Design a protein around this ligand. Structure first.
Ligand SMILES: Nc1ncnc2c1ncn2[C@@H]1O[C@H](COP(=O)(O)OP(=O)(O)O)[C@@H](O)[C@H]1O
Ligand SMILES: [Mg+2]
Length: 194
């Protein structure tokens, strides 16, 4: 259940944290980029596999802010990852996934792939672990990237910073990207960004 990062991964992380201190908001582009890629794979999978889109019927990317908990979630209904995939793809080696540590003290990755049960991968960057999601299969199919934001990144909880950023990066993504926001006597609901 517990693992150490490959030596190259530790170097990547430090290198990222050091050569990108200026453009931290880049993390959201990378994550939105990975969602889009996971959505292409299931889509390609659904060409020769009529069952492939069973666990979930939609192909989207939904982002929600949670202040009280200090969290930021990025969920896609792409191919998702198996337990073995979470361990190889996120523990061994275009900034990438680890750009998530530019704004987070902790990174959690919940993922459900058609060929396995929903798991959770977690890391504070000094090590990581994969466990079976005791909450069962709640995603259907896909991945949720949850970031435990650092103190200085708290401005990424404000729905306006997220929206401005999401629109820029949701420009070339051929999939609907929503942001759970509010309206005015104030109800919360998804808001398409692209
Ligand atoms: N949202 C996601 N859904 C499925 N797989 C993902 C997701 N995010 C990351 N991955 C996996 O992690 C791997 C490494 O991600 P990343 O660092 O962005 O490099 P890249 O996307 O260039 O391969 C991806 O190739 C993919 O296998
Ligand atoms: Mg990428």
């Amino acid at each position: 259940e517990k693992f150490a990062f490959q030596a190259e991964v530790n170097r990547m992380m430090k290198l990222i944290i050091n050569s990108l201190y200026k453009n931290k908001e880049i993390f959201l582009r990378e994550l939105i980029s990975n969602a889009s890629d996971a959505l292409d794979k299931i889509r390609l999978i659904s060409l020769t596999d009529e069952n492939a889109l069973a666990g979930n019927e939609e192909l989207t990317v939904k982002i929600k802010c949670d202040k009280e908990k200090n969290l930021l979630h990025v969920t896609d209904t792409g191919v998702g990852m198996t337990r073995e995939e979470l361990v190889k793809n996120l523990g061994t080696i275009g900034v990438g996934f680890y750009s998530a540590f530019l704004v987070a003290d902790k990174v959690i990755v919940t993922s459900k792939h058609n060929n396995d049960t929903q798991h959770i991968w977690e890391s504070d960057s000094n090590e990581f672990s994969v466990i079976a999601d005791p909450r069962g299969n709640t995603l259907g199919r896909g991945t949720t990237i949850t970031l435990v934001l650092k103190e200085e990144a708290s401005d990424y909880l404000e729905l306006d910073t997220i929206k401005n950023l999401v629109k820029k990066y949701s420009q070339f993504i051929n999939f609907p990207i929503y942001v759970w926001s509010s309206k005015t006597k104030t109800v919360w609901d998804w808001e398409l960004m692209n």
